[model samples]
Target: AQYEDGKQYTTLEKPVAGAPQVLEFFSFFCPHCYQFEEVLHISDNVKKKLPEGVKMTKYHVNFMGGDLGKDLTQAWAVAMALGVEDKVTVPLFEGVQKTQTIRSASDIRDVFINAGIKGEEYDAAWNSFVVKSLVAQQEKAAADVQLRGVPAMFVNGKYQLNPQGMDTSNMDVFVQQYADTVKYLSEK
Candidate 1:
């Protein structure tokens, strides 16, 4: 399958900082996004499939107000700060989806504790100025992309794609469809 610029994806004004430039916008609060998170666990499932330089990054989709999403948004920045997203990403998804309810501000830490991050290690990064700025940058990106919902993906920072919007009977083939389309766009 080939990627149609305006049909399958939309072009962005610029590329986000990264290699290969695949950015994923998701929310811990969005139950559907957990499906994407689940597929991510089969590591190399993405890495090997991706063409060289195509790296995917998970960014928090901040729309929930009144502190409902603040902690998680901040928590991701913390993970990025500690260079431990590989360890914390899963727990954060499970925290909101399976492990515990993250409806409250304080509950975001449950994922941290579950991931074995506690005390000073958690405190320092969670509240660091870097994390704050990172979260701010994420918010700015969301606006720049004209974000409308979770599970949104961009390929090469020039085109946006969403698998959930694609209707299919088989999950495996559906995902591959996205893989193929994204790869096609990247090469172009």
Candidate 2:
């Protein structure tokens, strides 16, 4: 989805205006986010089955406890700003979680370049007003939402879900349950 400069939401005006929106609040350094990614195929399939107006948006929470997490969040915001989110989102997650690499802004830039995005464009986007605004927005979301943890999910901005706070053994079940919840909401 496209996002306008200085807007907290995407360019769909109201991507979820008349739809069921699934917002994922996550962090790059969170282990649960990594595990959840591995099991995200179900969510992907469920997304395809969503109603015509249903949409999903991701909010990268930066409460993972360090400068690295903050940097990663900035990188994510940059990707979102550049309209190359599809090019870097999963790769950034994998580069940190699967590959066990510490991703700095430069490293993320490299990833974007390797993924076919131009270095100059990427650099420009990283410092754009949109990215800066997004970083501030993330901080506000974390604070005002009272989000003391990583990997939270919200449905239609009302129903909030967090698998990490639940029992570890229940992760898989919770994910399926979450998908079912979204499916149910979509039908409503």
lDDT of 2 by residue, 1-188 (tens): 12122221212222233323676677877777766666655357557667777667666776683777888878888877767766776787788878866557677678888889988887887788888998887676556456776666555654555333333466566556556655654443
Task: Quote the lDDT for 51 in model 2.
Answer: 76
- State the number of backbone clashes in model 2: 1
- Per-model TM-score, in order, reads 0.83, 0.74
Candidate 1 C-alpha lDDT tens digits along 91-162: 777767796766765667666777788767788777789889989877877776778887777766667775
> Considering only N, C-alpha and C atoms within 3 Å, which residue pairs clash in candidate 1?
20-53
Candidate 2 TM-score over all chains jointly: 0.74
Relative to the true structure, how large is the alpha-carbon lDDT of every model? 0.70, 0.65
TM-score between candidate 1 and the true structure = 0.83
Question: Candidate 2, residue 93: CA error in Å?
Answer: 2.1
Each model's total of backbone clashes: 1, 1
